[model samples]
Target: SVTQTMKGLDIQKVAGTWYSLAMAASDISLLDAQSAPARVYVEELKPTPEGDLEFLLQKWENGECAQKKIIAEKTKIPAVFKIDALNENKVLVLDTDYKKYLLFCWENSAQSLACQCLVRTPEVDDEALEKFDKALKALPMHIRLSFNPTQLEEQCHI
Candidate 1:
């Protein structure tokens, strides 16, 4: 369904490897397909020539890992997306700089809500990390938490 989303997003720029800095979720008790306490969500965004975007979202575990491939359709809005496998909820790019900072979220009604701060690089400076803290804080009701810093490099073409 068409919904409010980020505008004027560069789809090409959005498709790349990203490292999730911190994440906070609320009301996902029933989203059992979801994984938790993921230290840093690693994403590889794939864009089709037909303009559809898909991604492999993953998190490493104890000598193991979990991953899911999701296909998202672009609505009239640029940074907003819809994933049928995800209850067709709104996937939105809440904020990003296309370089160092990215803040994204998905929500279904008032019951389910979640967001994350991302960066292109694995090693984020204190200045940049604090920016994520402030961004997550801006959403006072999102029930936030931090992820331990990770050792990751450019994860591509998965």
Candidate 2:
């Protein structure tokens, strides 16, 4: 399996809200697709003093919208991060234009991969969709899932 991260990532440019458009994973269960379509929306991303990336995340829980915080610890490479909550699993910024869309993958500790595609707004354009497709083609085989922007807009008011 091959995964490629962006060559140059500017953390400042990527710090903003994003909505999930699609997702893929080696093992389908991690996605919880059979459940209530639970998804995590990125509220914000900020550079921490310790050089990690702090994320303000929102998701549905207990029939209510809930907020969460995750610290994506920076590695030697700017496009790679260590997720503390996932046993320090590696998350890579596979591709992004900063202003339009982002495609990333989380390398699970179990040697599997989970990828996500995000957009700046609820409306998706052709170019963004093309990039997401190309990124997926470059990765290994995975089970794909798509998110409805309507649900994202309605549930993630935080």
Candidate 3:
């Protein structure tokens, strides 16, 4: 359970650009970019089916805001994800998008491991978390990156 203070703390701590350090090839660059800074923004609030809070990710470029969207998928949680706590400079985001479960930890001042996004599903023996962690760790130090948000848009064309 997250308290009000915890929520505030988390939000204040995580509202900035987090760089990726796990990818050794680019030391402080985001996995999606070949530079020293990969920026992710914390946008406004939204409502969820479970009556919790949710946030949007604001996209920017050259220091100007470009776009924004809710980054988390709606699941069986509380419907909205909210900030929970800030400890050791880490922001803990609580997923209310389902049922008050799932937690995403975003580190504030580190270049090594920026985000640890996790979920708490009802499926008894699911190893999604473990697999996710492994996949994240196994990500190559260098890679070709591309962002095609609308690549699947044609699928809905009729």
Candidate 4:
């Protein structure tokens, strides 16, 4: 369904609490629909008997905490957690040490929400922010323009 996702995206690197730094939206309305702040929590990643990954995704919705159980294979092309019935998504890594700052991309086949730019730290230095901006230039212009960086900083610290 997709390609050029992250290499060495081992479960060990992914399971943990991650703050949503900024987002790009194809449907600008999604930003309006979300809560004041949102955090991505991969609380669990249990390997299936056949060697795949299933997970528990805890996030905020309409300013409230909501949870879901989903599956994420080390990604043979997937979702930002189930993109849609028809379209697919690919997760790409720009840079990350899994501490401080993380720059990443997610591109979906559908136009509803084409891509996203997620970072580890809520506030980034000008240097780091510039790299994020530069890396994002690699995304399709359509996806690139949708970037409306999140502004509320305190809430995501949870």
Best by lDDT: 2
Please rank every candidate by TM-score, starting with the best: 2, 1, 4, 3
- Provide the overall lDDT of each model, using Cα atoms, as 2-decimal numbers: 0.61, 0.72, 0.33, 0.45
Measured by TM-score, the strongest candidate is 2
Model 1 alpha-carbon drift over 4 Å, by segment: 1-5, 28-34, 37-40, 59-63, 125-142, 151-158
TM-score, cand. 4 vs. native: 0.53
User: Which ranking of candidates, highest lDDT first?
Assistant: 2, 1, 4, 3
User: How far off is residue 23 in model 1, in Å?
Assistant: 0.7
- Candidates 2 and 4 compared: the better one by TM-score is 2
Model 2 lDDT at residue 127 = 81
User: Which segments of candidate 3 are over 4 A away from where they belong?
Assistant: 1-27, 31-38, 50-54, 75-103, 106-113, 116-158
Candidate 2 lDDT, 11-98, residue by residue in tens: 7778778877777776666565433333466667676766687878776677677788878899999988898763648878888888
Better of 1 and 3 by TM-score: 1
The digit string of per-residue lDDT tens for model 3 on 1-158 reads 22211232223223322211112222345545422233443334354443444555544455455554543333233222334434233233432223222334333333333333322222321343343344445433232221222321222110
TM-score on alpha carbons, each prediction: 0.71, 0.83, 0.29, 0.53
- Model 2 / residue 17 / CA error / Å: 1.5
Q: Model 4, 2: alpha-carbon shift in Å?
A: 9.3
In order of listing, the candidates' clash counts read 0, 0, 12, 0
Evaluate model 2: give its TM-score: 0.83
Scored against the true structure, residue 26 in model 1 reaches a CA lDDT of 61
Regions of model 2 farther than 4 Å from truth: 34-38, 156-158
> Candidates 1 and 4: which is better by TM-score?
1
